[PDB]
């Protein structure tokens, strides 16, 4: 029919000088952390900066003796919103290298909770666990950006599972529905396994007593994880893909998604075997 | 009780992995231009330099357009440039998204001014990243605390939600244009989405979708250079001064970021 007005002109700001920056709230000063442990303080100092990820490597069988010391910051920091905001900034702008590093860190950390019989619950504050939902969303976003030969050229692609889990998370952050969907099938694709690993902690933290069965499935996934699995799975899958994919352009699209290197701002450690 | 996973999908334990593999780039070829300004612009484009140093006023872009085409449209290094830009966009905070959006819209306006056609085949390193940019803008909007959409004079919250759903769920670009053209735009967030959709939608319109194409052209023609940065700056400034939530400030900082990554950005157009 007739052409309609596009938009209310009052939406536009008053003319002025070019805007070259976006404003961000000024950050209140941080309090001193509540520990005198110089190893823990050193680890926090290094988490604040984008250190080369090889420097942040931590052998996972040494993590149990570091867990309770590091809790003095990870659980008990008086700077909770500062730390979570720093980690969310890195995750929200993360390439797949960065996503993978953060996922291995968060799963190894969650296994320490399991080893010490700590419960998972969104009430108690934990700067690592409380960014696991943002990390799941970022992983789904990276998977959706990959050329779809990455999922189709697996031995058992299970592409309908990849698509539906990604849909559930990307459309409406339907985390528990993604767990319900994943538990109806044996996992046979490494991409599906990455999704299962990424969903297990964000789901466990929001389960209530009525979702005890889903919680038990998340605990099964967490127990089967082994330190370094996320990086190991991606390293293998990406190498195999370069050795078999006939597309002229897939490698250029993939390199952009994977990125040149990880950003470790807010990352305390990269756990490895 | 169902087995959890086939153990054969797990890789052989070997070396600790401290990086993810990507192949090395070949040597790039010389760009097809001797124009000193354009070659200087390309050298700056390769680095993450302060964005104040890529500023380009609206009176200067029209004359530099045809010179810049020698790279943007006719480079022998198309995959180098596009993959560099897609890498920045795929890891972008909102500062970076905003800069690249203004760049793409001003570039698209120069296409219109010169009666060029929009299509997927025409190789253009700026327009061929506009769909990635739209997806990234939607991703940022969805992470913002919702006080950002609700605290507008006319939030149109249902429009923001549906457009974000269409793009994030299945990249339904033309359906998003169809939905947007049913209503007058009254929220700055909806206007940003409309600006971000118009070039990706124009590029994939066929002969059966000339009415949608025409709507994209109205949006592109009404855009004013710098609008994306100006709108976001005003809106973020008002929200800081009026939102009472402490959690919102910290979350907003994380999404917005503290500076842009200009790697692959050729220019930041302004008034
Ligand atoms: Zn491929
Ligand atoms: Zn707010």
Numbering used by the authors:
A (entry chain B): 145 to 417
B (entry chain A): 147 to 417
Study text:
KSHV also expresses several early proteins including ORF57 (Mta), a member of the conserved multifunctional ICP27 protein family, which is essential for productive replication. ORF57/Mta interacts with PAN RNA via a region termed the Mta responsive element (MRE), stabilizing the transcript and supporting nuclear accumulation. We also obtained the high-resolution structure of the C-terminal IHD from hvsORF57 in both the presence and absence of a PAN RNA MRE oligonucleotide fragment. The C-terminal IHD of hvsORF57 forms a compact homo dimer, approximately 65  ×  60  ×  40 Å.
In order to investigate the 3D structure of an ORF57 C-terminal IHD experimentally, first we purified the hvsORF57Δ146 and ksORF57Δ153 protein constructs in the absence of RNA and screened with a variety of crystallization conditions using six commercial screens (SG1, JCSG+, PACT Premier, BCS, LMB and Morpheus; Molecular Dimensions). Model building and refinement were carried out against the same data, extending to a resolution of 1.86 Å. One CHCC zinc finger is formed by each chain from residues C293, H385, C389 and C394, which coordinate a zinc ion in a tetrahedral geometry. Residues 181–417 form the globular folded core domain preceded by residues 146–180, which comprise an extended N-terminal arm largely lacking secondary structure that domain swaps, wrapping around the dimeric partner's globular domain. The groove is bridged by α-helix 6, where residues Y311 and S315 from separate polypeptide chains contact each other, with the sidechain hydroxyl oxygens of the Y311 pair distanced by 2.6 Å. Analysis of the surface electrostatic distribution indicated that the groove has a net positive charge.
